[PDB]
Write an enzyme that holds these catalytic residues in place. Structure first.
Site, PDB file in Angstrom:
ATOM      1  N   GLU A  50       5.997   6.500   9.812  1.00 25.74           N
ATOM      2  CA  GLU A  50       6.019   6.040   8.775  1.00 25.74           C
ATOM      3  C   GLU A  50       7.804   5.696   8.806  1.00 25.74           C
ATOM      4  OE1 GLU A  50       5.360   3.772   6.467  1.00 25.74           O
ATOM      5  OE2 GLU A  50       3.705   3.488   8.413  1.00 25.74           O
ATOM      6  N   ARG A  51       8.423   4.950   8.127  1.00 22.70           N
ATOM      7  CA  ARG A  51       9.907   5.335   7.656  1.00 22.70           C
ATOM      8  C   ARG A  51      10.182   6.481   7.257  1.00 22.70           C
ATOM      9  NH1 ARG A  51       7.654   0.729   6.009  1.00 22.70           N
ATOM     10  NH2 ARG A  51       8.068  -1.316   6.446  1.00 22.70           N
ATOM     11  N   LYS A  54       0.333  -1.374  -0.344  1.00 18.81           N
ATOM     12  CA  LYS A  54       0.245  -0.232  -0.561  1.00 18.81           C
ATOM     13  C   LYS A  54       1.176   1.112   0.215  1.00 18.81           C
ATOM     14  CE  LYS A  54      -0.473  -0.471   5.005  1.00 18.81           C
ATOM     15  NZ  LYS A  54       0.664  -1.721   4.732  1.00 18.81           N
TER      16      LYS A  54
END
Ligand SMILES: Nc1ncnc2c1ncn2[C@@H]1O[C@H](COP(=O)(O)OP(=O)(O)OP(=O)(O)O)[C@@H](O)[C@H]1O
Ligand SMILES: Nc1ncnc2c1ncn2[C@@H]1O[C@H](COP(=O)(O)OP(=O)(O)O)[C@@H](O)[C@H]1O
Ligand SMILES: Nc1ncnc2c1ncn2[C@@H]1O[C@H](COP(=O)(O)OP(=O)(O)O)[C@@H](O)[C@H]1O
Ligand SMILES: [Mg+2]
Ligand SMILES: [Mg+2]
Lengths: 173, 52, 460, 511, 52, 458, 64
Positions: F180-181, F154
């Site tokens: 997130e990363r 996704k």
């Protein structure tokens, strides 16, 4: 332990006493009210499930040493919430707030042997620069330390005992 | 086999250091407890109050 | 002199209040006179104000508030050493058979630290039990943990007696049997099955069965362990049996609920893995000795994912599964070679010949499974002549895993045999690779080594 | 010779001379409660959150709460011998750990105390255990390969310097085998390695250290250990103490590799610490912030660009980029990769290597299950040669492993699926490899050429291992220098492909 | 090599006994800035030599 | 003027004079050592106490520190000057360039547009992805959500949508990275900058390193920038990289704020926290926001409260699944679970609609047969159910496509498939005119012609 | 042990006069605000389900 629920009552009683100049009477009133809570027959009653106003009125009766309006009103407010056992702590926090407002301190000096009463003068003078407050020493004698002195002022300690030095060296190695 | 010998050297050396270190502190403690006298105690306290 | 006073009593939990400076440390013992007899309390938590919360090593009925409590300055201490061999003791190390005082010379606290990293034995040895199935398919590491997943009726206790005997006679170790929360009847008839096979002189017994309060069933595992640790310090090799580790976990859960701690994954205590590791970590080999352990395991709802099995399996090394079927064939011990497993079976640790021999017999048997499945539906004649050969060899291997124990003479009359590992390797190498094809399958049943199978055949 | 007593005695004497007899002022408190490893301290007005509080003995507690009236702390060691009323002292230090290159080859407690018997550490100061990773502008993209030894992962699941790559599987599947075989291989490539064991059995840890020493790797590794016996706080905090030691090399422009032995057991220890403090649990009874736990940890494995290294090191180091690679290990019950914590971590790392127990029992080892294992940086982390030879091989085997399970009965294009499930099955037969036998990129490359270009359609499964065992010796005899040439460079040319067919043919005709 | 380690250990142990009496005194006189004589403490240092 | 009085994790308590107490959502400031820390007040407790969340690392805070009451909410730069630059949650610049030369600053707490102002737009928006715009087409100004567990694709899908829409689109665009990363934020920042589209994209990052306050409030900052661009009369693209981290950061903080837990440990205000955000991201008469939101699904459980309460806020829902990705079939979209508001005969035309419904019908009939196929094998099937199974597997393959951003993973080059070109291919497969090709002829190709070709080469 | 909206200055008021001088039972004062719930002190005559009128033109429903 009632340290946390005592804070509001201590602050309120101290503010009230300050406005009316009677701090020194309020401290005696609280001392006596805390003393009646330690009694064997009363500490039994306070644990029972009596209604608050009945517990207050039967507690008020045991104290004629309370200025009739406000000193009793404090008891009534505390009894409403079920906190009369907090008095022995309201007292100590009242004393602390007073010591803060009158900028006074009480520092313990622990020594292997009593000091010369000329040493104590220097220690007190130096602390009164360490602190904004007027100090009151209460020196003591301990045989575990064996030279030097421990100065404990609140929760700050200045450690010059030889015992501390030995056991701080042992860890360097 | 050579590394296994180097490790044993290091380990015996450490043990031998440990013993002497704890004897150094124990001895210093006994000496201290034997040597102190009132002028020395006062000498300590009177100095610490100056840096206080 | 006694300095504490009871304050609360709720079920098995007791709260006592000491002077502010003299509060007991954790795990310290206390004692009170519960009427006529003393009761021992173990401290679990220090609450504020000198109050300390404890759990009774006994029934707490009859305790009043305000009773005087005396502070013993040390944890529960039990008698250890040679004096305890052949005696039954409870959690507190009190003799529970009728034979009187234990003549011990020394007493140890049951709470201890695991061996420090630099004490562990710098090698990875094996324990030679002398039972062919175990030594071949699931070797024991010296200082390992071993699960024992058999059910009932298959002879768990006769296997336990066989090990208790062999580790005393062939090696020169002792043994300890800790009964954690299991039926009293089993314990009594086990105590009798041992006394009449003479092994009772070589084992030390400690019993905290289901009838006992939770505090007893919790710690009893540590008493047996701290006796095994005494035998270890003497340089010996020890063997420690725990009759159900699952009940140790459950006693931990009960006590945790009593203390009021929040429930964890499936209701288990939050401290589950630490409570298990602090036990399983004290039994290891060591530069001076070693404790091996054989632990009966029970899996709730047959679920190998449940947190209790999942936590125990992280510590086991081997795993022997007993089978109702292999016993119905009249073959003993009833170990199942296909489900039994050990993580010592690797060439790097056990050698290539042993590893490949074990894998060989396993392949043979699991093929014979499908062959005997075919036979039952299509009859014997459907099989190839290679398949008939595999059947004839599988049946001989399956026989050769039998053995006469010294302890079973009551049953079989045949004298027992202690089979070295060398001999098991030789024998199974033989049977597999087509040697010994020329003699009948009953020449292998309950024999011993193979140089005795040839002589049984000689005159069969 | 080298147990000179003069050396020892001067060692001690220097400390005695280097001693400050000066008194110092400090802040004090009293222990008010003790239970299950949690301490409740009254006092310490000057305590700060995250601080180290020093107890009698030589041990520390970490401050987790600053309530209105009391400090909640956890004890990092045996707590049983504490008691109400004991005094404690506030240091000035947020939790700290010794760091340096002097730790290389030492086995160390999670607080930095050496637990091998070899005496005190030599170390370059201290580093804070809790930190925030470099921001988005300080990173760099990962572009350099980290060779494990294994054909399977170096070709399907490539790992690059600065990547984070989960090893996930069931128990007794070869997770630790793969991780320490990754360590052992960096023995000779200028990467410092770190191995953190959390909640492991102490004997197993001693066995791992003994194997690292056996293969000469130990001189290059730091070993941080928190065994199954030790307090839950030490297991909870062990991997942060390991990342604090790995980040020493990262920030100086070097490369490091760190292995968290079980981040399932860290999560369990944290769940314990959290339930003992009455925090409301969530799914599977884990706390609310069990994601943030692993998130703030693994986000420290990074590659930092040259400007960050210059700025951090005050201009000492120019033009070098540091990095720290991570290989966390997770354990799954019954092959469930859709549990709470395995999926929390699959969501933080840059890929996963999933080791499946069915493959492992069938002898396919390492049991890399393609189609669940992935590398989120992909080919960018490989050498050029490997990047060309491998290609879609993992999706090829995901295809194959649906198709061979569907066509469990029969087949179509029997000739076409014969030569497919010949190679789509001889690949699986090819990627299996022994333990402690790493093979250089040169050796893996021609092997993937043989497999991928169709040369193995001529061979029966039982022959593959013989085929490779022969080929890797053939090219050590005949084509000896091309191996040296591919080991140095990424080395791909149409010249190389031509020469790599000339390698096949001269051997294929002379087995 | 282990036997050479044991020989060297006994040897160095018999050497260190000289030093412990130095280290204990240096420590005591560091902890108290008053230097101190020997004679008052003789049987202490002599036991320190012996008890290693 | 205030004093700290407690520090629990990320929440801090501060005591103010009785008449000086801050309002809810005001920002306070502390000097945490050689640092300046910002606190956002959440609740007013009795007695001048006020409870806050720290927008920074909470470590190092003593009790009794003095905190300064800034008398305004958190305000962030906004408008054209915030364009092509990376920003903190507090609106501070985080790339190494100079300060943001903004003319105006907006508060990140706002009310959603009135019902009277909303606007509705059937204008279909083409994306060159077969499955997404066959099964779940979306419109300019609508909301899209990508639902999926961990590691199912996704983010790759969102980068391909960025490629196919946000380079071929004139107006500005905004990207919020919530929890997130940081590796991927850096990769995206450089992919933009090395193709000169960076100077029409505004970035905000609250990545997973950061303490809960940042991940909690960083979504409102991206929304504030997008709302500024909307009110200027433009039309905007807003991509949110994982909106699930906005509520997880609330679950982390909730218990410390003294709120009783709810269904699975979630905060009791989950649906309101989520609605008061999702409600301000909408198009209106003055301008439109088109959005794509990645929505993580914990433990792959689509009935978990957090995914469950999100489906109601999206117009197109694309549900990715692990049991498809592990077949190598990418994008791993589940066509029996994806859906769009726009899939009406009156919006996409009868032929598109009818093709989509026929595809769902076939794949569902194929799901119903899997248990009998698993027990009794495939030979017990009626002679026409074997044909359903063959066409269903062909359709499952043909739903796969090679993306331009997934070249790094598979080598094979990307493909762009137009809508006219995909409904034709699926109508063909359904009507039976490709029954002679093998399944593998369809895996990872573009239009149907490339499948007809790949069959020649096996 | 935890407080129940007993706070310094309210307590001080009661110290000076325990029997609150008769005060409007038709009004009170907000003492807390969080997540849409307000705690009001006073309102002796509030009825369950009643509408309480806040500054601005807003209302609250008295439920506890
Ligand atoms: N490539 C390989 N070839 C053959 N055997 C292997 C290989 N890798 C690992 N093994 C074997 O698998 C066994 C278990 O491996 P390992 O202990 O590494 O798994 P693990 O995941 O660490 O288990 P645990 O999770 O219990 O620690 C080891 O005995 C090892 O010999
Ligand atoms: N090694 C053996 N030799 C002979 N008979 C055996 C052997 N093992 C088990 N048996 C038989 O099986 C029975 C098992 O009984 P027991 O040991 O009490 O098993 P359990 O305690 O599990 O019920 C024995 O009493 C005997 O009849
Ligand atoms: N079109 C595609 N082709 C090949 N692989 C793909 C494709 N789309 C996604 N993937 C795979 O999906 C994996 C999951 O990555 P990602 O999308 O970042 O997951 P998440 O959505 O959790 O961030 C990637 O590593 C990549 O290999
Ligand atoms: Mg392992
Ligand atoms: Mg993502």
């Amino acid at each position: 332990e009632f340290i946390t629920v005592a804070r509001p009552y201590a602050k309120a009683a101290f503010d009230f006493a300050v406005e009316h100049q009677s701090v020194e009477r309020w401290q005696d009133m609280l001392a006596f009210a805390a003393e009646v809570t330690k009694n064997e027959q009363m500490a039994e009653l306070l644990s029972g499930a009596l209604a608050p106003e009945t517990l207050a009125e039967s507690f008020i009766a045991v104290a004629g040493e309370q200025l009739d309006e406000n000193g009793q009103n404090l008891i009534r407010v505390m009894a409403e919430n079920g906190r009369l056992n907090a008095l022995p702590d309201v007292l100590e926090q009242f004393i602390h707030l007073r010591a803060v407002s009158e900028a006074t301190a009480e520092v313990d000096v622990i020594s292997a042997a009593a000091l010369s009463e000329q040493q104590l003068a220097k220690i007190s003078a130096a602390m009164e620069k360490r602190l904004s407050r007027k100090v009151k020493l209460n020196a003591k004698i301990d045989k575990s330390v064996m030279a030097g002195v421990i100065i404990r002022a609140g929760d700050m300690v200045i450690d010059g005992s030889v015992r501390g030095r030995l056991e701080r060296l042992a860890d360097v190695l | 086999a050579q590394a296994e010998i180097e490790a044993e050297r290091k380990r015996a050396r450490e043990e031998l250091r440990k013993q002497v270190a704890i004897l150094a502190v124990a001895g210093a403690e006994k000496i201290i407890e034997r040597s102190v006298d009132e002028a020395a105690n006062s000498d300590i306290v009177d100095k610490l109050v100056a840096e206080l | 002199m006694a300095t504490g006073k009871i304050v609360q009593v709720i079920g098995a939990v007791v709260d006592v209040e000491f002077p502010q400076d003299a509060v007991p440390r954790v795990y310290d013992a206390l004692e009170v006179q519960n009427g006529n007899e003393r009761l021992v309390l173990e401290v679990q938590q220090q609450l504020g104000g000198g109050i300390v919360r404890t759990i009774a090593m006994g029934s707490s009925d009859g305790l009043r508030r305000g009773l005087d409590v005396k502070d013993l300055e040390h944890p529960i201490e039990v008698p250890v050493g040679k004096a305890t061999l052949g005696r039954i003791m409870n959690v507190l190390g009190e003799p529970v058979d009728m034979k009187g005082e234990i003549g011990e010379e020394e007493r140890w606290a049951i709470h201890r630290a695991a061996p420090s990293y630099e004490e562990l034995s710098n090698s990875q040895e094996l324990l030679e039990t002398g039972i062919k199935v175990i030594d071949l398919m699931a070797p024991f590491a010296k200082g390992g943990k071993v699960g024992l997943f058999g059910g009932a009726g298959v002879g768990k206790t006769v296997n336990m007696m066989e090990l208790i005997r062999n580790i005393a006679i062939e090696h020169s170790g002792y043994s300890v049997f800790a009964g954690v929360g299991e039926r009293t009847r089993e314990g009594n008839d086990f105590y009798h099955e041992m006394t009449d096979s003479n092994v009772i002189d070589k084992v030390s017994l400690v019993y905290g069965q289901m009838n006992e309060p939770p505090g007893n069933r919790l710690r009893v595992a540590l008493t047996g362990l701290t006796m095994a640790e005494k035998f270890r310090d003497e340089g010996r090799d020890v063997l420690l049996f725990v009759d159900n580790i699952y009940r140790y976990t459950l006693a931990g859960t009960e006590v945790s609920a009593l203390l009021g701690r929040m429930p964890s994954a499936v209701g288990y205590q939050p401290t589950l893995a630490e409570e298990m590791g602090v036990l399983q970590e004290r039994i290891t080999s060591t530069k001076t000795g070693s404790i091996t352990s054989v632990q009966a395991v029970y899996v709730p709802a047959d679920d190998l994912t449940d947190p209790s099995p999942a936590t125990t399996f992280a510590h086991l090394d081997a795993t022997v599964v007993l089978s109702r079927q292999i016993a119905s064939l009249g073959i003993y011990p009833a170990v199942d070679p296909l489900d039994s497993t050990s993580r010592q079976l690797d060439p790097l640790v056990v050698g290539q010949e042993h590893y490949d021999t074990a894998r060989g017999v396993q392949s043979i048997l699991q093929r014979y499974q499908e062959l005997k499945d075919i036979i039952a539906i299509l009859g014997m004649d459907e099989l190839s002549e290679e398949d008939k050969l595999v059947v004839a060899r599988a049946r001989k291997i399956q026989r050769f895993l039998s053995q006469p124990f010294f302890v079973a003479e009551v049953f079989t009359g045949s004298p027992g045999k202690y089979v070295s590992l060398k001999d098991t390797i030789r024998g199974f190498k033989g049977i597999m690779e087509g040697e010994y094809d020329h003699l009948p399958e009953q020449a292998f049943y309950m024999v011993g080594s193979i140089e005795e199978a040839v002589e049984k055949a000689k005159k069969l | 010779m080298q147990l000179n007593s003069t050396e020892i005695s001067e060692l001690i004497k220097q400390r005695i001379a280097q001693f400050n007899v000066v008194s110092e002022a400090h802040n004090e408190g009293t222990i008010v409660s003790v239970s299950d490893g949690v301490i409740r301290i009254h006092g310490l007005a000057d305590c700060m959150q995250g601080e180290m509080i020093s107890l009698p003995g030589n041990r520390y507690a970490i401050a987790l709460n600053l309530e209105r009236d009391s400090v909640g702390a956890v004890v990092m060691g045996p707590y049983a011998d504490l008691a109400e009323g004991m005094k404690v002292k506030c240091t000035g230090r947020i939790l700290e750990v010794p760091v340096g290159r002097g730790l290389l080859g030492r086995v160390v407690n999670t607080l930095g105390a050496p637990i091998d018997g070899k005496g005190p550490l030599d170390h370059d100061g201290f580093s804070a255990v809790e930190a925030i990773a470099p921001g988005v502008i300080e990173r760099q993209s990962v572009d350099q390969p980290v060779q494990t030894g294994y054909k399977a992962v170096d070709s399907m699941i490539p790992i690059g310097r600065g990547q984070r790559e989960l090893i996930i599987g069931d128990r007794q599947t070869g997770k630790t085998a793969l991780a320490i075989d990754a360590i052992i291989n960096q023995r000779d490539s200028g990467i410092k390695c770190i191995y953190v064991a959390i909640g492991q059995k102490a004997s197993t840890i001693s066995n791992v250290v003994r194997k690292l020493e056996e293969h000469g790797a130990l001189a290059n590794t730091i070993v941080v250990v928190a065994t199954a016996s030790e307090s839950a706080a030490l297991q909870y905090l062990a991997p942060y103490a390991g990342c604090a030691m790995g980040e020493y090399f990262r920030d100086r422009g070097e490369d490091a590799l760190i292995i968290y032995d079980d981040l399932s057991k860290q999560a369990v220890a944290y769940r314990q610490i959290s339930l003992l403090l009455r925090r409301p649990p969530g799914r599977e009874a884990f706390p609310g912030d069990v994601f943030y736990l692993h998130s703030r940890l693994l986000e420290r494995a990074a590659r930092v660009n040259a400007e960050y290294v210059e700025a951090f090191t005050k201009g000492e180091v120019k033009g070098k980029t540091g990095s720290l690679t991570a290989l966390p290990i997770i354990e799954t019950q019954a092959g469930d990769v859709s549990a709470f914590v395995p999926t929390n971590v699959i969501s933080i790392t840059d890929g996963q290597i999933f080791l499946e127990t069915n493959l492992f029992n069938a002898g396919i080892r390492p049991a890399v299950n393609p189609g669940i294992s992935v590398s989120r940086v992909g080919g960018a982390a490989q050498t050029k040669i490997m990047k060309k030879l491998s290609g879609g091989i993992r999706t090829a085997l995901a295809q194959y492993r649906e198709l061979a399970a569907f066509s469990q009965f029969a087949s179509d294009l029997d000739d076409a699926t014969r030569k497919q499930l010949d190679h789509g099955q001889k690949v699986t037969e090819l990627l299996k490899q022994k333990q402690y036998a790493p093979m250089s990129v040169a050796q893996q490359s021609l092997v993937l050429f043989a497999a991928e270009r169709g040369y193995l359609a001529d061979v029966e499964l039982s022959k593959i291992g013989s085929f490779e065992a022969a080929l890797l010796a053939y090219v050590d005899r005949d084509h000896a220098p091309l191996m040296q040439e591919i080991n140095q460079t990424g080395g791909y040319n149409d010249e190389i492909e031509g020469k790599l067919k000339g390698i096949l043919d001269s051997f294929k005709a002379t087995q």
